[PDB]
């Protein structure tokens, strides 16, 4: 009735991380998972899976459910946190209101994911990435739904969650303008691997002309090249860097194309720590080097801008995110 999108809410865990739930099986076994726009596998632990960092998870049972279809191709899926072992296996996945056969990873082992299995409360990750990017060569959730005339496009947004603010939605299958304020600008993808678009940057004298950028919804923080990095925090008083909140010298981060404009105020990548210090703040930026000028526009850029990932018009869309709906 009228919402003709399946949106999925979304919850903040300590502004590090954001979840949304998803089921798996013909009787709808619950999971808590990271949406991760940078990677293109999902999966879920298994009942098979006696590691301890299970224990404290909602398991999946093959066994229980009429619509599952036994694979057993040995896989591993390798994240920036670790690894995590299983084989494949193909079962009815609902997300939010729309449901699917899908191929996944059933993980029996995830000692090789620790400590942050076991100190975070996901069971597993959903991935939002491009096929060529996932293993098993598995088409996207997203495009499978799209294929299926399960949606109207075959595109997602992201409105995240603010710690202590508001909640968020994953929004599959079409954009909505309650998500939004300014213009919603487009960026096209320069490659079809990641969701990576070209941005010239500029933060205070230093400055990089047409840098790749990657929107990743699974990264805490936003990278910059070690080099700009330093330069940056020169002067600085910033002894991963830490401040005084009130700091009149942090600056503000410039992101430009042909066809719009983005800025990160440090209000958008300064973590309250105060509990540590007095008006002590975190600083949400990591020095990251890849083969070519790269930043990673992880949640704090995602947080300020609502995305749109589009994978019939191969580009990300921008646009500022509402404060509160």
Same mark, same amino acid.
């Given at each position: 009735?009228? !919402?003709?999108?399946?949106?999925?809410?979304?919850?903040?865990?300590?502004?590090?991380?954001?979840?949304?739930?998803?089921?798996? @099986?013909?009787?709808?076994? /619950?999971?808590?998972?990271?949406?991760?726009?940078?990677?293109?596998? $999902?999966?879920? /632990?298994?009942?098979?899976?006696?590691?301890?960092?299970?224990?404290?998870?909602?398991?999946?049972?093959?066994?229980?459910?009429?619509?599952?279809?036994?694979?057993?191709?040995?896989?591993?899926?390798?994240?920036?946190?670790?690894?995590?072992?299983?084989?494949? !296996?193909?079962?009815?996945?609902?997300?939010?209101?729309?449901?699917?056969?899908?191929?996944?990873?059933?993980?029996?082992?995830?000692?090789?994911?620790?400590?942050?299995?076991?100190?975070?409360?996901?069971?597993?990750?959903?991935?939002?990435?491009?096929?060529? $990017?996932?293993?098993?060569?598995?088409?996207?959730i997203v495009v499978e739904l799209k294929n299926q005339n399960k949606?109207?496009?075959? $595109?997602?947004?992201?409105?995240?969650?603010?710690?202590?603010?508001?909640?968020?939605?994953?929004?599959?299958?079409?954009?909505?303008?309650?998500?939004?304020? @300014? /213009? #919603?600008?487009?960026?096209? #993808?320069?490659?079809?691997?990641?969701?990576?678009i070209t941005l010239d940057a500029h933060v205070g004298n230093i400055?990089?002309?047409?840098?790749?950028?990657?929107?990743?919804?699974?990264?805490?923080?936003?990278?910059?090249?070690?080099?700009?990095?330093?330069?940056?925090?020169?002067?600085?008083?910033?002894?991963?860097?830490?401040?005084?909140?009130?700091?009149?010298?942090?600056?503000?981060?410039?992101?430009? !194309?042909?066809?719009?404009?983005?800025?990160?105020?440090?209000?958008?990548?300064?973590?309250?720590?105060?509990?540590?210090?007095?008006?002590?703040?975190?600083?949400?930026?990591?020095?990251?080097?890849?083969?070519? /000028?790269?930043?990673?526009?992880?949640?704090?850029?995602?947080?300020?801008?609502?995305?749109?990932?589009?994978?019939?018009?191969?580009?990300?869309?921008?646009?500022?995110?509402?404060?509160?709906?």
């Open positions: 009735l009228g !919402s003709s999108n399946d949106n999925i809410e979304l919850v903040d865990f300590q502004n590090i991380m954001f979840y949304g739930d998803a089921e798996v @099986g013909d009787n709808q076994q /619950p999971f808590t998972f990271i949406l991760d726009t940078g990677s293109a596998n $999902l999966w879920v /632990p298994s009942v098979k899976c006696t590691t301890a960092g299970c224990l404290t998870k909602h398991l999946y049972d093959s066994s229980k459910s009429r619509t599952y279809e036994k694979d057993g191709t040995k896989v591993e899926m390798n994240y920036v946190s670790g690894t995590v072992s299983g084989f494949f !296996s193909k079962d009815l996945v609902t997300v939010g209101n729309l449901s699917l056969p899908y191929k996944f990873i059933e993980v029996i082992d995830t000692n090789g994911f620790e400590p942050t299995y076991t100190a975070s409360t996901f069971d597993g990750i959903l991935g939002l990435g491009w096929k060529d $990017l996932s293993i098993g060569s598995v088409d996207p949606i109207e496009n075959a $595109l997602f947004t992201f409105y995240l969650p603010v710690h202590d603010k508001h909640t968020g939605f994953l929004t599959i299958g079409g954009i909505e303008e309650r998500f939004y304020e @300014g /213009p #919603l600008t487009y960026e096209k #993808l320069n490659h079809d691997l990641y969701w990576q400055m990089l002309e047409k840098a790749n950028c990657i929107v990743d919804s699974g990264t805490s923080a936003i990278t910059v090249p070690t080099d700009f990095l330093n330069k940056m925090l020169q002067n600085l008083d910033v002894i991963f860097y830490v401040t005084l909140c009130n700091n009149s010298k942090l600056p503000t981060f410039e992101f430009t !194309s042909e066809n719009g404009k983005y800025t990160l105020e440090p209000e958008y990548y300064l973590q309250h720590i105060e509990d540590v210090g007095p008006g002590l703040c975190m600083l949400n930026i990591i020095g990251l080097d890849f083969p070519v /000028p790269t930043f990673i526009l992880g949640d704090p850029f995602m947080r300020k801008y609502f995305t749109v990932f589009d994978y019939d018009n191969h580009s990300v869309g921008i646009a500022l995110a509402k404060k509160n709906l």
